């Protein structure tokens, strides 16, 4: 796709501090751009549009070449139209915003300048953030993590992209997303679908597969910290079925690891760390911070701070595991008691390590969840399995939870803020901030 400027395009401002192994963090200035996927696509002489509602343009898309030819991404109004807002070192994403239509949620990449991703390689360092999560009810998922795409959104690769990381093209992840209207160039017209429960939205005939470190994937009852591996480590077209991922009939038919090695408190049985009030470890109505360090291992470690008090990771047993760093040993002990084979057929933490130790871009979001109402991170999944069933309570939401146009319904002013977002040598990002 091409990039059209009917709406002009503007990146809200965002800074984060680097910080270093002397003891001192340096402020850097970055800025934040929505993904390609909400953007109005339309006609590159006119205000036709490409895709509306979930169908694209027969006319103007017979294919995903002469789409991607005949069609471009226009610019983002923020605020008004994507609940969209940064002051400083802080970013708000709002749920549903209503403009001439309504809005659900946003994906959010940090920009190095208005035309690159920012990259990190997390390998041997430490990534810290605050968040308020205290207006996400079940359902909601306020989204922190990183992910292994190229810092030109694809331009390099597919030059019929031309709008590029600007417009926020590029996107990948672990469930190879089919959902992406436009993918390597060309547009994801071929074979669509249009959702049957979502307005909006649809499936096509590829997707878009790459390694995804899921730091922060959370509400006010739930979080967990899940890596997930692929066979290819960055960005990598696939075709249909053979996709795999939650967009795809069969789930484990590709090259990722959709499921990961996920470390959740509350599943793993402290039911009391992490919640809404006094009664929690960690109190949900309060701001908090995340800190996630990447051992050269591949083993990753995890503390938090609230109100001046450090907690680690709890502890957690399972199987013969004992601890609380999430590690091989860990990984393993949650297939062998909870289930699965997936992030170990895909390498586990070694194959993961490959993508730490190169560059992977941060994502922020807030969604809700049109395929599973969000239940694997926050309720009982399957739904019909009791806390009987190893690992299958991940969380106190009601199995009845997570009605996307519920939620939306009743919602609509939830919101996600994540700020003061550090980034150094592990040890390095509690130092002052610069
Ligand atoms: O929060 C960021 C998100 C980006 O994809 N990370 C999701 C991350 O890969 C696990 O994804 C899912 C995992 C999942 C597991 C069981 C049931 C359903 C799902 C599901 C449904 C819809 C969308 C995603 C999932
Ligand atoms: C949960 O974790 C916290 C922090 O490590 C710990 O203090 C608390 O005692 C744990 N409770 C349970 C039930 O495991
Ligand atoms: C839940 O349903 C699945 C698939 O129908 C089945 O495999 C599983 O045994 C069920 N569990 C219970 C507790 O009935
Ligand atoms: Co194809
Ligand atoms: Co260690």
Redesign the pocket.
């Known amino acids: 796709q091409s990039a059209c400027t009917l709406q002009s395009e503007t990146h809200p401002p965002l800074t984060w501090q680097k910080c270093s192994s002397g003891g001192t963090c340096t402020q850097q200035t970055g800025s934040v751009v929505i993904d390609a996927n909400w953007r109005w696509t339309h006609a590159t002489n006119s205000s036709t549009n490409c895709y509306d509602g979930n169908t694209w343009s027969s006319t103007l898309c017979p294919d995903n070449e002469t789409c991607a030819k005949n069609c471009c991404l226009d610019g983002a109004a923020y605020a008004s139209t994507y609940g969209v807002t940064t002051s400083g070192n802080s970013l708000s994403i709002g749920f549903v915003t209503q403009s001439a239509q309504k809005n659900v949620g946003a994906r959010l990449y940090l920009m190095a300048s208005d035309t690159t991703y920012q990259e990190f390689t997390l390998l041997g360092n430490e990534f810290s953030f605050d968040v308020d999560v205290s207006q996400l009810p079940c359902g909601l ?1 306020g ?1 922190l ?1 990183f992910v292994s795409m190229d810092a030109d959104g694809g331009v390099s690769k597919y030059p019929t992209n031309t709008a590029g990381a600007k417009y926020g093209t590029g996107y990948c ?3 190879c ?1 089919r959902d992406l209207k436009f993918i390597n160039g060309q547009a994801n017209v071929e074979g669509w679908e249009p959702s049957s429960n979502n307005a909006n939205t649809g499936i096509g005939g590829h997707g878009s597969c790459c390694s ?1 470190m ?1 730091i922060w ?1 959370a509400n006010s009852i739930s979080e967990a910290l ?1 890596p ?1 591996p692929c066979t290819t480590v960055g960005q990598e077209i696939c075709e249909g079925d053979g996709c795999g991922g ?1 967009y795809s009939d069969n789930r484990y038919g590709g090259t990722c690891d ?3 090695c996920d470390w959740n408190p509350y599943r793993l049985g402290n039911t009391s760390f992490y919640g809404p009030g006094s009664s929690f470890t960690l109190d949900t109505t309060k701001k908090l911070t995340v800190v996630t360090q990447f051992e050269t291992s591949g083993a990753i470690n995890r503390y938090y701070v609230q109100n001046g008090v450090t907690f680690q990771q709890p502890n957690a047993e399972l199987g013969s595991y004992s601890g609380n760093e999430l590690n091989d040993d860990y990984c393993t002990a949650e297939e062998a008691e909870f289930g699965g084979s997936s992030f170990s057929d895909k390498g586990g933490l070694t194959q993961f390590k490959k993508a730490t130790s190169g560059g992977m871009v941060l994502v922020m ?1 807030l ?1 809700d ?1 049109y ?2 109402n969000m239940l ?1 991170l926050d309720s009982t ?1 399957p739904t019909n399995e009791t806390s009987s069933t190893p690992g299958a309570v991940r969380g106190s939401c009601s199995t009845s939870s997570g009605v996307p146009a519920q939620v939306e319904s009743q919602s609509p002013n939830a919101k996600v803020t994540f700020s003061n977002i550090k980034f150094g040598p592990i040890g390095s990002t509690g130092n002052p901030s610069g």
């Open positions: 998922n989204a993590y992840d672990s469930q997303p995804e899921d994937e899940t997930h939650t959709p499921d990961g979001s969604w969840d395929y599973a694997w999944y």
